[PDB]
Each structure stands twice: as structure tokens, then as C-alpha cells.
Amino acid sequence: TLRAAVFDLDGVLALPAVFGVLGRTEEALALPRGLLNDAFQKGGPEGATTRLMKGEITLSQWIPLMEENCRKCSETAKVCLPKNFSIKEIFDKAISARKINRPMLQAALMLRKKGFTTAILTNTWLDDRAERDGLAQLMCELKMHFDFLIESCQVGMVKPEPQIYKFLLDTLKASPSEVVFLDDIGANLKPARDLGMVTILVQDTDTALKELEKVTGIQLLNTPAPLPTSCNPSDMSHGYVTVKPRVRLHFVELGSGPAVCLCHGFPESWYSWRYQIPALAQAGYRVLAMDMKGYGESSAPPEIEEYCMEVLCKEMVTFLDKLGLSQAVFIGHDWGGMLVWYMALFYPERVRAVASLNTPFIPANPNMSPLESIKANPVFDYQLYFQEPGVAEAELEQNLSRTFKSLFRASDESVLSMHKVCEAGGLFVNSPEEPSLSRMVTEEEIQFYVQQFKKSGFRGPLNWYRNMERNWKWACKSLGRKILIPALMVTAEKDFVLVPQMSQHMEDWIPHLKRGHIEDCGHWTQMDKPTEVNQILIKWLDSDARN
Amino acid sequence: TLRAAVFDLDGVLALPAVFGVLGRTEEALALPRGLLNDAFQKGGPEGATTRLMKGEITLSQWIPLMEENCRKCSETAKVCLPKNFSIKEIFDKAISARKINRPMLQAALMLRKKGFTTAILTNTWLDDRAERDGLAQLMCELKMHFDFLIESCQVGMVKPEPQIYKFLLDTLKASPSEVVFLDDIGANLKPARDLGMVTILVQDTDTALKELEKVTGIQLLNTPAPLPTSCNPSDMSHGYVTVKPRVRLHFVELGSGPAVCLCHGFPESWYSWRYQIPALAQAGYRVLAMDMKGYGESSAPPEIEEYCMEVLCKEMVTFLDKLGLSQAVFIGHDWGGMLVWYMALFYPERVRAVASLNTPFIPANPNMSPLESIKANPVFDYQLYFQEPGVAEAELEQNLSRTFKSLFRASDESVLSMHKVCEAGGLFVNSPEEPSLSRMVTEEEIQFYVQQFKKSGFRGPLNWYRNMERNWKWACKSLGRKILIPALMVTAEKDFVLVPQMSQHMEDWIPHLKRGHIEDCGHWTQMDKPTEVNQILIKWLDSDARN
């Protein structure tokens, strides 16, 4: 029956009710109980506040109009008002004080995730205060999590006025019988019920939910803590920068603030950051999730030299150059991590801070060459099998779906022998033709990667592994340096190829290196433990990158 | 003969020579003349500074190494050093003190603009200081104005070492005989001359130029002040955001900082901002030059309603939503200006500040309808001729090249009667088939607009003029409000359709409205007086938007 959940802002998705603050201001200032609220609701339908609620006048225009009310109302009850009394000062404080009632927003999401059409019906105003950005940001966040957002000062109708409820109904394209309306104000519930909608008086959050859980027959309370917000490719802003005649890099941009450039690994995409992209943005940053040269919508020249670490790095400096960014926080995973370490070693000027996940910085050995060293570690055997051009491509491209479902797996799921790969003659030689779906990725998520690699295949990506000798000779130029800029090394316990023990000597080249670890975390960090990663990175960015 | 000009950074394109500061530090601190410089050049080819110059060690690694030198050198001349002596403190100050020697950079540009291949050959270092961003930004600017930038700490060679000069020669793809090398250090000139290159000892800027002007046979000195920097479309970063199922907006992004959204007018493009885009970026902002719905790479649905002011505005709020921007500075011209005024009236929350060029805010008249009002102003007659769908399209699309060359003209150039257009049955009825090339635009610039309008034509753009009634009824909803957020109204003297006298009553609806005017400035402001516009907007942004 029910198919729509509509939430109120002040007192439901947002607390504490910017409203309530009035009652406290009075108690606080020992003012006649209701003095402030009466001046607020003064004029009723023809009130200054009702106007301000219908978008007739701005909040800034209202404040003075709401001051007079505090004098008239004070003139009736035979009272006064302190000298430092400020309606502005009061509301700015009340508003910024209000925060997203997390459990409520989550309850809303759940409903949506299970077929419900969500919407926010609220009696708000046109905020032109200097601190208006407060609201702006709060909404900037809530907005995305709801199909609709019906603002009073926008639709020219406020709440109890039935008109708006017909509007809501008509907007949702649903009849009262299949809609749940939650408000903290009783009056706003009647019109709702008179239409025959399920209404819930939201007093204490937990109870409202109980009723909601009840009426909707979905478990909203004491429910497992979700995964961070994932972003829909088609809703993202896509960016393209030509760094060289035949090379254009594609990236997804979201947020404002210190620029944080995310460089995924092999064989991934910008999408590999789908969980930290909103989080970090929301965290106060301007996230630039890259599509590393050779992947997704980025250029993939066939040439192997085109993917040596030096070239790749210069192109990233150029990417910044073209974008007008002097610096930028570089956070990389897998190959991306290798890339950002060399970005801090050759372009400190452009790297605001450096951070790597799984990939440890290990100064190249002046004597022994890469090929030799790699051969000295059964786990890296897969890298040798990536040398012969075409060979690896053929297997990986054979069945994209199977390729990604076989790769992207938790540490406990495995299904890909990694020891004797060159020996087995293949990476999948003894793997299922139809691998089970990993916990980390949904069918869609995998198909996204598929369509992406259908463009340029695995030749470009694989070439990242085909410049060992070159990258080595380059790295040798930096054997005298040291990472002195803010750095963070996040290691993942259950990563059996990029084992944490490999980063134990990093502090020698990176003295003030900070760290992070993650339990039961396979190689595919972003996907495996998204919450932990966002938490770890934001904490670090906030203390070392925002400066 | 000459075809290449290579400039040194410290002492040529950048002053005052971060170097020289040493001599002053000594004089300042009454230190034995050269004490500090000797500790600096200590070790010669095998010096700590030579290493740091070849990229062997970072500046941060060097500082301590350069301190010891100040003790050894002080130990020889029988001297000491104050307690608050800091090599770090000294250099940070010296470096941020250095600025782009404007006349020199300009001289360089000129040369390039006249066929010269320019390049910066410098003995720099890997700056990993906390204030490294200083250099980063200075280079971020110089870099673009030169074909090449050969850094010592990057190429593994410092200056006098001939190797680098062969490198320069080989990089420029030119022989000594056709290259001019300018340095403030004599030693760096010999290797140059030994190759047979024209060298110029740069002491005082003006003289160096005189010699340069001489050797190159091009007037570099006392030459007219150029136009701001224009941006090459193919070098710009392009962004795409889908705001609705069938609507994707295209924009050009450059810079970092408060987001400033530029909304061009009819019939233009993001390119109409080609002069303020770098300037503003360089000014400390994140410029987002839009391609307004109906233009360039943006979607152009045929529907007329799709271009009413309300719809257009919601889509801009969505553009922000998708980009993760809570606010944004909206600056518009012509129709764009009309758009940003309504953006401040319906979405104050999202507009950090509002600014308009030419277009004045004029509250809609509750009684009289648009059609009627417009008919009451012979100059607006052109707008009536834009009503009948197809008609205007046919003429404007007939000859794009002629269309734009006829439109984009200084106030003194004219060539398009505007009075009786509906009467003449056409906007070009008595205009040349091959209009002369305006001072404001080069042939290429015009052809850019052409190729752009070859995509969606003039139907989309023209529809902006086809929603009068609708926009009117919408505007009436805001007749009670007022623009209380930071606003700037820039008027152009010689604009005969959007005359300055039309903005004389704005302060009534926008109390704290700031202003700007421009002399002899036709309608096409961005193009007519680019310098004045950048100056006006940056001044305002810096005091009202950066806050």
C-alpha cells in the first residue's frame, strides 16, 4: 500500500528545531513564556512570518519585521527586552546549531532503497543572511537523498494550507493512502490525515521511526550501519583536459575546497573511489577522481613508453597546469599510490600533500634491477606474466565480466591463485568461468567497470607494468631526496601482495610520515572498507592538508 | 636570423633575485661582505647548493646543509651570527618577495606573438617548503607564456655546465645563431656565446630590453599595453553536467578558490569571457565559464518553455548541486545578467554574490505586461522581431560568419540599424554581405563562435527572448523581496540598447548595490574593454566575494 515517505525538515531531518530555540531564548532570558513565539506567529495567515514563509520577503527583510513584534508583544505583557537582544544573533545561532538528524536521514534512505519515493516538505524561507551558506550546505547534502524537495518559500504555499498537500500528492504522483507524512507539528498532520495519508507525529526520533518501521513494514531502527554514499556516474560532473596532443585525461569532480586528486590503480577507474568521492567532498574538499591514462574515458595510446612513471607524472603536472591548480592533494591506490609517491619526489611544489593506500614507498635499489628483484618474490610473479605484450591482454579482455568478478574480491573470497601464474600460463587458469558475486560489488557496479574497459581494453593499463627498467633509472635520480611534505601511508591487513610489512622502513625516507591501518582489508581497499578509508583520509586531510 | 628567446628566471623574469637578498642580509646584519654568499657557493661543483640545484636533494634538505656553511665561513673570517639568524626565515622571505618582472614577461610574449619560440632556462630547486606554494603559483603563471621551461633541478644539469646549453639548443630545435639568451649572471653567458648565441647581460630591465629590441628588431619597449591573456579553447578544461534527463550544460573551468560562475549573453558562449577567465583565475578564484543552455556544447532542446527564466534558473541550481558547490558567485552579461539577478532573488542561499554587466535589474511591472512595455522603446524593437519562431533563426543562421562580424562590433563601428528592424523585416536588411573585421575580434575568434553555433543554431538562444509573459508572471512573485547579498552593477557608456540610465533606480531594490562604469564601451563588454572589466570585477570579488 504505502509507497511514499515525506519528511519535514525542522524537527524531523534537521534538529534541534530552529523553532524551539525561541522557547529556550525566553527561558534563558527569563522572558514571559511565549513572548518570543507570539511575536513570531504574529499576524497569523497575514503574518510577517507567513509572508517570509511563502517567499514574499527574504529572511533579512523579516528580521526587522520580527523585532517590532518583540516590542509589541513585550508591550502587552508589561515587559521589556535586554539591550543586547538580537533576533539576528538569535537565529544565526539557532540555524547553524541545527544538524542533519542522522538516524532519520538513514531511515529515509532505507525506505528509498526499498522502492519508496521520498520527499522533503518544509516551511522554509529565502535565506540571504551572510551566514546563509550554512543552510545552503545542509541542503546541498540532504537534497540528493530525496526524490523531491518541496520548499514553502519556493512553491508559494506554507504548511497547513491544504493547497500544498494537493501539491505534494500531485508531485509524488501518489494518492494519500500510499503516503506517510512525518512532522513535529500537529497542525501540519491534520490536512494530511484529512486527505487520508498515514501521519506520524515526530516527537522523539526513535519512536517516530518505530511507528514508521511499523506502518511501512521495513526495519528502519537498530539496522546495520550503511555504506558511505556511492555516486551515480550519470549524476557526476565529468571533466576533460588535454595534456598533450594525443592525450586527454578524464576526471570526475565534486565539491569545493583544497583540491584532492584521486588516482586509482590497475585495473580500475575513477569509479574505484565511488565511496570516498562524496564523503571527501562533503568533508570540505574539491575531489578530482581521475581516470588514469589508459583507463576509462582517458586516452590510451598503445605505446608502452607512454606509461612510464616519468611521462605519467609530467602529464599530471600538466593536468594541474591546465586546470589552474598550483598544488593539489594526491591520494593514490595500487599503481596510483606509486604515482603519487613519485609526484611528491619530483614535484613537491605541486603536491599539497601525499597519501597512499596499500602501495608503500620503497626507494629503488641502485644495484639490482627491478626485473631481478620482482623475480625474488613469488607474489609479484603475476607482474612478470604482464610483460609479454598481448598475452595478458588476451586473457583479461577475454571475459571482462569474469575478469572483474574474479579480481574484485574480499580477502576471504579469493578465487585467483597468484603464486604460480607465469607457470600456470594464466591468471585465471584454474578460476571459475562464472565467479560468484563479491560482497564488495553489486552486479551493476561490475558492469560499470566492464563498459569502461570495453573502450580501450587492457593494453594501456598493462603498460604501467611494462616500464620497470625505465621507472627504475628515473627513481635513481631521487635517491638523495626525502619526502618532507605531509604524507599518509594507509596499509591494509589482508592485502597479500602489497603486505604492510613492506612499508615498515618508510619513515627513513619520509620522517614525518603518518599512518593508517585497516583490519581484514583485502587489496581493493576503497571497496572493501569504504567507511574506514573515508574516516582515515578525512582525519588526515583535516589536520595536514586543510592547514 | 634570430628565432628563439630564452629567459632566465631569477633576475630576468623574476625580481628581485632571490639570490641578491643574501648581499642585503649581510649588509643588513652588518655581516662580513660575502659571508653569506660564500657559505652559499661553498663546495663549487661539489657544493651542497650545486646538488640542490641539480635536483639531488630538496630545498628543505639543503637549508640545514647551508647553515653549517654559515658557521664554517663565519669561523674563517673570525665572526659570529645573531641568535635569531635563520636561513629558512631568510629564504622564505626572499622567495615570496620575488615577483614576475612584468615588462620582461611582456617583452617575452611580444616576441612569441611575432614568431619567436620562447623558453625559461633556470637553475631552480625542488621546493618542498611549507610556503612552497608561493613558487608553485608564480610558475603556474609564467609556464603558459613560454613554449619550454627548462629547470635545472629537473634536467639534472645546472648553469654554466655546457651540457645544459646543448640541451637547450636541442630542445628549442634551433642553432645558436638564431637564439637570444638573457641572464643576470655573467658566467651563464659565456657557454652561451661559446656556442655562438646572442647573449644579453640583464642588469637593469629597461636596458636589457633595449638590447633585445635591438638584436631582435622588434619594438619591445614603450610598446602599447597588451590585452589581458586570452585562453585557447583546446587548452581549457571542459566540464559537463547533466542537470535533467535531456539537458547537459557545458562549462570551462580554470583556477581554484571561491567559485565564480560566468553566464554569457545572446548570442554568445563561454568564449565571450575569454579575457576574464585567466585574469579571475589568476586573481585567486575558480572560474566556471558557462555555455548557457541553448549554446555551444550545452543541450539545446527545441521547446520554448525550456528557456523561460524559472526553468533556466532551477537548472543552474542543479548545476551547482551536481558539482558539490553550495554557493557560487554569479556574474552575467546581457541575458546572463538577467539570469543572475533572478538567481539572487530566488536562490540567495546559493549565490555568494551577484554581478551584472550592462543588464540592469528592473522589477517587473505588476500591471503592464512585457510585450506592451517592450513595444514602448524603439531600441527593444529587435526583441519583437525575435518572437515569431523560425523567422529570426533563418536570418541569423543564413551566414554565421556575417552574423557574428555584424554583431560583435565596437560602439563606434556599428553597421546594424536597430530602430526599425521589424519594419525592415530583418536585422541585416541593410548591412554588408561581407562586414569588415571588428577591432574587438580576430578572424579566428569569430570563426570559433561560428563553429559553435553550427551545432545547435539560433533556435535555443532565441527562445530566451520567447518567454516574456512567463518570466514576467514569475518575477511578480519576487516583487516584495530585495537583493541584500553583495551585488555589483557594471554599466557600459556606449551601449545603446542597455543604456546606463536604465540602472539608475536599482539601489531601491538593491540597497547596498556597488557599481562600475566603463567609458566608450559598446554592448559587447567582455570583448570591448577586457582590462577594465577584469580590474572592476577582481576589485569587487576581492572585497565582497572572497570575504
Ligand SMILES: O=C(O)CNC(=O)NC1CCCCC1
Ligand atoms: O604496481 C604495483 O606497485 C603493485 N600492483 C599490484 O599489486 N596490483 C594488483 C593487480 C590485481 C591483482 C593483485 C595485484
Ligand SMILES: O=C(O)CNC(=O)NC1CCCCC1
Ligand atoms: O535580454 C535582455 O534583457 C537584453 N538583451 C540584449 O540587449 N541583447 C543584444 C543582442 C544583440 C543586439 C543588441 C542587443
Ligand SMILES: [Mg+2]
Ligand atoms: Mg516542523
Ligand SMILES: [Mg+2]
Ligand atoms: Mg640568474
